Amino acid sequence: KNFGLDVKITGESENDRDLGTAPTLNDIGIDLRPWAFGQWGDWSAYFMGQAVAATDTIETDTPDKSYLAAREFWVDYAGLTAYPGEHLRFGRQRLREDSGQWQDTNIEALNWSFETTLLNAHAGVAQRFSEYRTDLDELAPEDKDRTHVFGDISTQWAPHHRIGVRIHHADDSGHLRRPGETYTGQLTWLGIEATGDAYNYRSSMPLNYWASATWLTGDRDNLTTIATGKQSGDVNAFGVDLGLRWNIDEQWKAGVGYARGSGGGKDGEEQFQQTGLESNRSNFTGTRSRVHRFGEAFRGELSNLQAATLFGSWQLREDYDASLVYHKFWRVDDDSDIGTSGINAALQPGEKDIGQELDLVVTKYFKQGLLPASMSQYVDEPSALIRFRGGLFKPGDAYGPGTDSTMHRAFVDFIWRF
Ligand SMILES: CCCCCCC/C=C\CCCCCC(=O)OC[C@H](O)CO
Numbered sequence: 250k251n252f253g254l255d256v257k258i259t260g261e262s263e264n265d266r267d268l269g270t271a272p273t274l275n276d277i278g279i280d281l282r283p284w285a286f287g288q289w290g291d292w293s294a295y296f297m298g299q300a301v302a303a304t305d306t307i308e309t310d311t312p313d314k315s316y317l318a319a320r321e322f323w324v325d326y327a328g329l330t331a332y333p334g335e336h337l338r339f340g341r342q343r344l345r346e347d348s349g350q351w352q353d354t355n356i357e358a359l360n361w362s363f364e365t366t367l368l369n370a371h372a373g374v375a376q377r378f379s380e381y382r383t384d385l386d387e388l389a390p391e392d393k394d395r396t397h398v399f400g401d402i403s404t405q406w407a408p409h410h411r412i413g414v415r416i417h418h419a420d421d422s423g424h425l426r427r428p429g430e431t432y433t434g435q436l437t438w439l440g441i442e443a444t445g446d447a448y449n450y451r452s453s454m455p456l457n458y459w460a461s462a463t464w465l466t467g468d469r470d471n472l473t474t475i476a477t478g479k480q481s482g483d484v485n486a487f488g489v490d491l492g493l494r495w496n497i498d499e500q501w502k503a504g505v506g507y508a509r510g511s512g513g514g515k516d517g518e519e520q521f522q523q524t525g526l527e528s529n530r531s532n533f534t535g536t537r538s539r540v541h542r543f544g545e546a547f548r549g550e551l552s553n554l555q556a557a558t559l560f561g562s563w564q565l566r567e568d569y570d571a572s573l574v575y576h577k578f579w580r581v582d583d584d585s586d587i588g589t590s591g592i593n594a595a596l597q598p599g600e601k602d603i604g605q606e607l608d609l610v611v612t613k614y615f616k617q618g619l620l621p622a623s624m625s626q627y628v629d630e631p632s633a634l635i636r637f638r639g640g641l642f643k644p645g646d647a648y649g650p651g652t653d654s655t656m657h658r659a660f661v662d663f664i665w666r667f
């Protein structure tokens with residue numbers, strides 16, 4: 250198929266991102282994604298654009314109310330080897346791994362993929378140079394002049410069981426403001442990961458699991474503030490994520506998860522953070538729909554954060570699925586921030602209890618708009634669908650007096666493909 254058009258109508262309700270402390274969303278929008286694909290022997294090329302119009306600045310994809318954008322544009326060469334799962338891709342492209350915790354984003358990259366039955370491997374380099382959007386003229390400061398280089402290798406050591414290692418390096422080439430006029434880093438994540446159909450919603454096994462452990466090292470120049478100077482320090486942090494899923498039958502599943510990113514230490518030196526390319530969204534509940542690993546509402550980054558998780562899920566053939574997820578969150582170090590949550594409000598010193606969340610995702614998949622698993626737009630939308638995604642967050646003692654007791658973020662997406 251050489252071209253198509255994705256049409257999405259989205260409503261978003263958000264209340265209240267700052268828990269009532271500062272001066273919400275209740276809005277609707279349309280999202281149009283024309284795409285083009287060509288293939289000629291070992292060569293191929295792809296483009297997807299995006300046009301959005303909304304009643305306010307809503308999230309239509311996991312600024313002005315309306316804008317145009319270039320989502321993906323790449324050329325691909327598959328001829329280095331005869332293995333069909335092996336190819337080299339150049340351009341702004343979808344980078345993804347199954348957990349979503351290392352990379353899950355569209356970014357300018359050169360990425361080599363090698364995927365066979367017994368051995369998987371990948372290697373790439375990436376950097377943002379623009380938003381390619383009509384409404385945003387500049388890059389985020391964290392992204393400006395930051396280069397990513399990464400790789401992984403893994404093998405299937407038994408049927409349905411994979412073991413692997415993964416590396417990522419981020420280098421900041423920018424400079425901090427001189428005194429009188431938030432950080433630059435060189436950071437390396439080195440991870441091991443074991444999975445037993447962790448993200449395979451079609452598993453034939455009665456039990457599935459994931460386990461991963463990641464060591465973060467390198468250093469950060471933190472700007473102190475008008476700037477007054479800089480603090481440098483080595484980083485030596487550690488992250489872990491574990492989960493177990495019971496495949497009760499063809500339809501019912503349930504499971505438990507635990508994750509922890511280290512925190513604090515002298516000037517935040519024992520503070521884990523993620524690569525900045527992660528989405529934290531995955532099929533961990535065992536359905537075709539991806540779920541935010543740390544809540545649709547809270548949207549935690551694994552950083553001075555401990556989370557315990559429980560979920561249940563239901564699906565009927567390829568027609569429906571649904572998931573219900575509960576999370577409880579604690580800070581690891583009670584005098585340090587958690588960073589990168591879906592909540593913009595200050596924490597009270599000495600309190601670890603971040604809060605609790607309940608999530609619900611419900612999807613009906615329509616017969617029209619079926620895609621090949623090859624496309625990058627198949628992970629989120631395998632065909633037309635209608636989906637509700639909602640999260641209810643109850644702030645704990647760490648947020649303290651005069652904050653709302655409850656906050657929610659909910660979405661409906663209706664998607665039709667031509
Ligand atoms: C530096 C990155 C380079 C990325 C190249 C981006 C190209 C984006 C889309 C190219 C679309 C390719 C199909 C269109 C085309 O070339 O014509 C082919 C015929 O129409 C069909 O055989």
Ligand SMILES: CCCCCCC/C=C\CCCCCC(=O)OC[C@H](O)CO
Pocket residue numbers: 458459460491492493505506507509555581
């Ligand atoms: C493949 C394993 C699947 C297991 C999933 C759920 C695992 C839940 C707990 C395992 C151990 C986690 C420790 C929980 C805990 O409170 O530890 C204390 C922290 O280390 C304090 O920082």
Ligand SMILES: CCCCCCC/C=C\CCCCCC(=O)OC[C@H](O)CO
Pocket residue numbers: 263264265573607608609639640641653655656657659
């Ligand atoms: C089967 C469980 C159903 C609920 C699961 C997760 C909840 C998902 C969406 C909650 C719907 C909106 C709740 C409204 C609410 O509690 O807060 C209102 C304001 O946001 C309070 O600031």
Ligand SMILES: [Ca+2]
Pocket residue numbers: 265266267269270271272273
């Ligand atoms: Ca507000």
